[PDB]
């Protein structure tokens, strides 16, 4: 778990804005930028998988998720749902209807939905805590810092942004290392193709 205070402190130090009195960058701006960074980080690395198992009937037809990034598996009464669409097809094959963070089934059928998806748990207060591995700290800083360096404070801000991009790439490499060590098999040989 990462506290927001330490991310904020590192960003303030890096922006030469570690002054309690002045705060040229408002904390609302920093919290919004941290939300954006959490968005991008959780989308690119698929950090947070969530499972929701609800029921849809004729009364309520939609399943309201929260902070949706992507759906990787849908079951309806232990039956695979195959295609995804946003158009509300009248009849045909059974598809999953996505309505911008509302989930239903296109040629509607009474039943239950077991959906696997991805989530943010974004923050709104400086005293909150980000439920992410500590290795994700440097990728949060260097990603939110590139978002703020492009305020035209200095004539050489974009070269500094370019340097921070490489630093961010290295941080992402570290994060990928961690994720592979956690959630991946410890294998050393491949399997023969069986057809």
């Amino acid at each position: 778990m990462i506290e927001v205070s330490e991310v904020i402190a590192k960003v303030r130090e890096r922006l030469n804005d570690n002054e309690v009195g002045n705060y040229e960058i408002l904390d609302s701006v920093l919290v919004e930028n941290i939300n954006q960074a959490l968005l991008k980080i959780c989308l690119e690395f698929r950090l947070k998988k969530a499972i929701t198992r609800s029921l849809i009937t004729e009364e309520e037809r939609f399943l309201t998720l929260n902070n949706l990034l992507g759906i990787e598996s849908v079951k309806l009464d232990k039956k695979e749902i195959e295609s995804r669409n946003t158009i509300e097809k009248d009849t045909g094959e059974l598809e999953l209807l996505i309505l911008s963070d509302r989930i239903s089934v296109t040629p509607f059928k009474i039943g239950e939905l077991e959906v696997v998806y991805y989530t943010y748990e974004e923050i709104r207060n400086i005293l909150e805590t980000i439920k992410l591995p500590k290795i994700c700290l440097d990728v949060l800083v260097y990603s939110v810092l590139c978002n703020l360096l492009e305020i035209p404070n200095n004539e050489t801000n974009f070269s500094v942004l370019a340097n921070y991009k490489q630093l961010l790439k290295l941080a992402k490499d570290n994060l990928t290392n961690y994720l592979s060590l956690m959630y991946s098999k410890n294998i050393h040989f491949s399997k023969v193709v069986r057809v």
């Binding site: 030469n16 804005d17 002054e19 002045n22 040229e24 404070n153």
Partner: protein, 53 residues
């Protein structure tokens, strides 16, 4: 130079040139050069104010 006026002018020039837009070394250097020029001007200010008094 006069020391305390130099310190106050150095602080004021670091407030005018705000440090969010500045690398710290160039900020301190430009504030020091402007404060030294302000001392060189304030000498003539002291002479002119003595004459006017």
């Amino acid at each position: 130079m006069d020391t305390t006026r130099f310190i106050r002018n150095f602080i004021l020039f670091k407030d005018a040139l705000q440090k969010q837009n500045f690398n710290n070394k160039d900020l301190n250097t430009t504030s020091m050069q402007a404060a030294l020029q302000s001392e060189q001007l304030a000498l003539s200010e002291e002479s002119q104010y003595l004459q006017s008094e």
